[PDB]
Design brief:
Two copies of one chain form a homodimer. The first copy, chain A, is mainly beta and about 30 residues long. Helix content of chain A is about 0%, strand content about 60%. A three-stranded antiparallel sheet of chain A has the order 1-3-2, with no helix packed on it. Chain A starts with a strand and ends with a strand. The relative contact order of chain A is 0.49. At the A-B interface, strand 1 and strand 2 of A face strand 1 and strand 2 of B. Chains A, B: This is HD5(63-94).
Chain lengths: ~30, ~30
């Protein structure tokens, strides 16, 4: 899958597929 | 960043960078 751990909302044509934990902060996992 | 949420270990050239949670399972976040 092609995904990004985003500080903000998922982009156009992405879906929220889960979350990322990076260095004590939570991120959206946005995938397309 | 170009990262993958992997079921297995990170590749030799990748850097373990965090954790993905997707549909009730945890995955390594492995980044180029």
């Amino acid at each position: 899958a092609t995904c990004y751990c985003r500080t903000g909302r998922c982009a156009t044509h992405e879906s929220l597929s889960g979350v990322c934990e990076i260095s004590g902060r939570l991120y959206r996992l946005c995938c397309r």
